[PDB]
Structure 1
Amino acid sequence: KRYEKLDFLGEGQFATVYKARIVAIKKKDGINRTALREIKLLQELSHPNIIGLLDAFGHKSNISLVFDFMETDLEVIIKDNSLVLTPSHIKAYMLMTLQGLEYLHQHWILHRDLKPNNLLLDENGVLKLADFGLAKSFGSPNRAYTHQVVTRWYRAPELLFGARMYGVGVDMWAVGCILAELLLRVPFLPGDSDLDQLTRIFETLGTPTEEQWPDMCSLPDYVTFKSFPGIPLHHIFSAAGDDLLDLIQGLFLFNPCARITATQALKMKYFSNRPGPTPGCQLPRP
């Protein structure tokens, strides 16, 4: 083919990824459903902040998926002790993530696997959502989903209570967690199980009631907790300005309907106010 293998990048549980000459090639049930999901969704989408399926082909069961090669991801940036995340850098990452998510949601697709490692960065500082192996189309009535999606530290409380039907909130809450991970340089709510994740959520952000979440008791796996006051958001994020606290509070609203959407988040004063988001050229290199 035109794609000659150049270097090895890594191996995943469902496929192996290597850099080919510059692109990234990802390699009785038939073809893997994760690969089919990624193919069927990335062929229907085209946005600057969404990973692009440049080409696809293969032999028998194994399929080669061609993607643009990405230099790094947000997880490496966050975990990089040497790197310093100014509010401008945080704004830029948040803006690119939210623009990609807004495009994805306008086409009725939930990513459902949002985490810093799934936000890839190229050499030009353009952030792209990757790993659509869990993504699904949303908006169809009477079509139950699964509540186990999203890595636990980023899983929304409605999911942890067993929500079969949901919307963009499951991405939005994950986005908030990423934002928290961008501000603290450490994961925000590192639970050990579903109950521990719910406990950390309800300890840091207070337990919610019917006043904040009217129909929470109807979720099949709803568990009653003790009442925690919850740390005020300004104590958790001391260096954050008022607009950033407004954005975080909107992202972390317990009611997923009231939770701010990607478009609503992009219209918030946080992105409009000074300083502006850092251009991709000057974004930190890990």
Structure 2
Amino acid sequence: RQWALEDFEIGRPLGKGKFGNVYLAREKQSKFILALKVLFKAQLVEHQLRREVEIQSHLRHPNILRLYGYFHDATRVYLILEYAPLGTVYRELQKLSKFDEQRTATYITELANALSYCHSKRVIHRDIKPENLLLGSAGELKIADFGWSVTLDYLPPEMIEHDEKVDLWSLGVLCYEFLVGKPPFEANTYQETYKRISRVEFTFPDFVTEGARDLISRLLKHNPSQRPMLREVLEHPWITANSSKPS
């Protein structure tokens, strides 16, 4: 099944690359709303993207951004993606200052469900930034990454100093960011940020509750091997108490 640029009406830009641009878009015939990513073959990594799209086009999960298909011309490559009406988690955090434990734990559940669904396919994910986390019409979180396989603040010690312990560290930075309003190792300089992650030096403000500290503390281990299984995250009693979504 083929596709062409003239099949779509284009609306407003949703962002800049990442080697290109995303625009709100509509299929002319069905009027079906979607997002179109336009990437340029020069900055093409080229072989890599091909494999990324290979894997992403097989991923069906309510919390993964769907890739409906792709096509290309001489100069560009086009990605036909699901549209997320409600924007980024990063933007929501800005507006709310920080999230409550229920919104936080529901997101963590959703992230962990997606990552486990992918784990069940020997597909693993690297690091995870909030700007790459979008929200569907029902408020459900969606992963929008080229971070599938097989800023410093978001990287585990082993990235700065099926081996998927990286995205468990990611769950912990996000969970902390979500409750707190800023990532755990944030510092005034690059050198300072580096040592904080390397040394795993973070602390909690008093409002952060115990079940939260527990989960976060188990996720932010220097030793990747000691970080929890996704299964253990979803069964964490603080997750179990607070999240509105099930496994």
Structure 1 CA distance, aligned partners of 2:98 and 2:50?
38
Look up the match of 2:25: 20
* SS of 2:208 mapped into structure 1: coil
- Answer whether contact 1:88 1:278 (CA < 8 A) is retained: no
* SS of 2:239 mapped into structure 1: helix
Shift of 1:245: 1.8
- Answer whether contact 1:112 1:135 (CA < 8 A) is retained: yes
TM-score for the superposition, normalised by structure 2:
0.83
AA at the equivalent of 2:131 = N
Identity of aligned residues (%): 28
Shift of 1:260: 0.9
Look up the match of 2:93: 78
Shift of 1:254: 1.7
Alignment of 1:125-274 (within 5 A): 125-132=139-146, 134-137=147-150, 151-161=151-161, 167-190=163-186, 192-193=189-190, 195-201=191-197, 205=201, 236-273=204-241
- Answer whether contact 1:78 1:186 (CA < 8 A) is retained: no
Shift of 1:263: 1.8
| CA displacement 1:165-217 (0-9 Å, x = unmatched) | x7221111122111111111122223544x53341135663xxxxxxxxxxxx
Look up the match of 1:225: none
Shift of 1:26: 0.4
Q: Confirm or deny that 1:96 pairs with 2:110.
A: yes
Change in CA separation of 1:196 and 1:84 when aligned onto 2, cut-off 3 Å: closer
Structure 1 CA distance, aligned partners of 2:200 and 2:49?
37
* SS of 1:4 mapped into structure 2: strand
Change in CA separation of 1:180 and 1:124 when aligned onto 2, cut-off 3 Å: same
Q: How many residues were matched structurally? A: 230
- Answer whether contact 2:98 2:181 (CA < 8 A) is retained: no
| CA displacement 1:220-252 (0-9 Å, x = unmatched) | xxxxxxxxxxx6x5xx14223322222111101
Q: What RMSD over aligned residues (CA atoms) do the two structures have, in Å?
A: 2.5
Look up the match of 1:218: none
Structure 1 CA distance, aligned partners of 2:131 and 2:102?
20
| CA displacement 1:40-69 (0-9 Å, x = unmatched) | 121121111111101211212411111111
Structure 2 CA distance, aligned partners of 1:197 and 1:30?
30
Shift of 1:15: 1.6
AA at the equivalent of 1:177 = V
Structure 2 CA distance, aligned partners of 1:203 and 1:113?
19
- Answer whether contact 1:271 1:277 (CA < 8 A) is retained: no
Shift of 1:96: 0.8
* SS of 2:7 mapped into structure 1: coil
| CA displacement 1:132-161 (0-9 Å, x = unmatched) | 1x4322xxxxxxxxxxxxx31111112222
Change in CA separation of 1:5 and 1:202 when aligned onto 2, cut-off 3 Å: closer
| Alignment partner of 1:11 out of 13, 16, 21 | 16
Q: Confirm or deny that 1:43 pairs with 2:10.
A: no
Q: Confirm or deny that 1:62 pairs with 2:67.
A: no
AA at the equivalent of 2:15 = G
Change in CA separation of 1:267 and 1:124 when aligned onto 2, cut-off 3 Å: same
AA at the equivalent of 1:6 = G
Look up the match of 2:127: 113
